[model samples]
Target: HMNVLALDTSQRIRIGLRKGEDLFEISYTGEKKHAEILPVVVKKLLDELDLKVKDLDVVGVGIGPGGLTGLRVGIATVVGLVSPYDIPVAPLNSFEMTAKSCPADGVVLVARRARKGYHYCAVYLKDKGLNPLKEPSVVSDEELEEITKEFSPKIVLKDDLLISPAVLVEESERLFREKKTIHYYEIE
Candidate 1:
């Protein structure tokens, strides 16, 4: 009966609260709204569930290869919220987050857009669990095509995902149980 809080600001601001077997989720979409709306939404969800930050068992945040500003604000907000508590934080990356939304039966490639003219590309063998065959890295337009052809993975573009908070919370809870979470200072 753990209370988990999950956040994904890779595209838009999203918060997911898991109170035992019940789950609550909210999303706010706008330019530069992560900093302004993240904490507000978190508080709203907590209030609706009659819980406090101290009540949270663990927190999850999407650390991205997408927008730097959004990821920065998202991670910072989680840190601020749990700083006073002993709660653990789970940091899931863009590629792993995308994989959670896609089919888990075969090789998958997440070729999401990145800053500049480059793109972030990775391949995962997801038969039973996610295994990164090709670690995520920035690739050029030409290199992206080359790798796509190389792996022939089920392609998952940037538009295919919005970083679902439900998935974040699910993974967060698993990580906490497995003792895979990080201390506040280890975040970077």
Candidate 2:
């Protein structure tokens, strides 16, 4: 059935499972409990869906602009979860994942709080994708304001919406199809 799984533990936590054409998802928003809750939830979901780590075709995780600890927990979980199976792990960013869902006509600017007074931002064209009006960068609110004034781009906030795991899973699948990979970190 080509089973695939995706997880996002960057801020809130969500998991997705795709078995052929059927899909399943579940999430937890317990703030700082991702490390504790994620494993339990993943195990429960797999049991309910009748899947094992070795049976997964692909494993994906949201590498983020969210919380530092949360991102580490997520990456470790995915790598530890799927490494033994030799499954390809897809590392997708939470900001860009939502950016794909962010709507626009001409151009769009997507951003998320990078730290305290700054945000992690990127720009995308309505027709293609990220246009680099400003590549993903850490900028203060005033800088963002200035950028907006110049580009007149529509802004998409990080909390604009909760990204469904299905959406995250689909994006990982797209990466596979297009043969694109972003090493990500906080990776050598």
Candidate 3:
């Protein structure tokens, strides 16, 4: 068992703390006040679990093609928390997180709103182990549908999916093992 904390502010403020086998997750919806809400949520969970940031083995964050402010806040917070302790930080892709959320076995398309008219989407093969069939990128509706027509993959949209923070932590753990973590300055 490892002590881990995961933060996802890509779209929503989703935080998950793992201490031993127990998992604590919390989410704050709404686009406003992320800066205000995130710290309190992290502290609340740590208090509930009787933990301190320094005790954490690793900190995980979602680095995304999402709201610029939210991504900045999330990455900045993670950097601040782990910088002093020299703990590893896992830079998880939001689309990959969504792809892992799907239970189906086959090729999957993970799409989220990228802008007013374009969507950020990626293709993942979910059998055996998770594999990225296509890298994440922005695409038009026609392009997205074309991929769907070609792969006939399951489509997971952020609007319809509720990703758990524990999932982020789990993915982060796997990433850490594979040495997939990033340095603070490497975040982008």
Candidate 4:
């Protein structure tokens, strides 16, 4: 059996486990406490599961198009933990994760806070298994129109539920089973 740890601090702090097709999750708003609270939260999760860091077979992190600082912390923490243990990692896109969460087939756009009043966005096609119609980008609402015109995807604004690592873990397992190469933003 494989045990995977999935983390996404893109818009919120979340950690989850994927064991076969099932997913278990824990999330914290963090508010302004991400840096101070993440490690402790993670520790509690591991303890609750009666596992340790060394028990993980793989680690997955959301490489955001989201909050810059939170994304950085999430990626860095995953790298620091997995690197020393020689564990493989998968870096997932925040947009793709959100797209998979959607119940219908259409294009999904995940927008995250960016500098200069813009947002980092990516356009994903649901029927294409979340393939990118437009690559991850930072743009204004006007620039986003160019992509929307091409895909005509139903827009789903960000929600609190979208940040859960449980969702990421489920998607990760599906992709892994399909033999797709998992992207690791930091490693690449």
Please state the error at residue 88 of candidate 1 in Å.
Answer: 1.0
| Alpha-carbon shift of residue 112 in model 1 (angstroms) | 2.0
Give the TM-score (vs. native) of candidate 2: 0.82
lDDT of 3: 0.79
Better model by lDDT: candidate 1 vs candidate 3: 3
- Measured by lDDT, the strongest candidate is 3
Question: Model 2, 13: alpha-carbon shift in Å?
Answer: 1.1
Where in model 1 is the C-alpha error above 4 Å? 33-38
Backbone clashes in model 4, listed as residue pairs: none
TM-score of each: 0.90, 0.82, 0.90, 0.79
Instruction: Give the lDDT ranking, best first.
Output: 3, 1, 2, 4
Candidate 1 residue lDDT tens string, 38-60: 56666777798889878888888
* Residue 162 Cα positional deviation in candidate 3, in Å, after optimal superposition: 2.6
Error of 3 at 106 (Å): 1.9
Write candidate 2's Cα lDDT for 102-179 as tens digits: 555467777777767898777666666544455677889899778777777655554444677887888878776666
Q: Which segments of candidate 3 are over 4 A away from where they belong?
A: none
Model 1 earns a TM-score of: 0.90
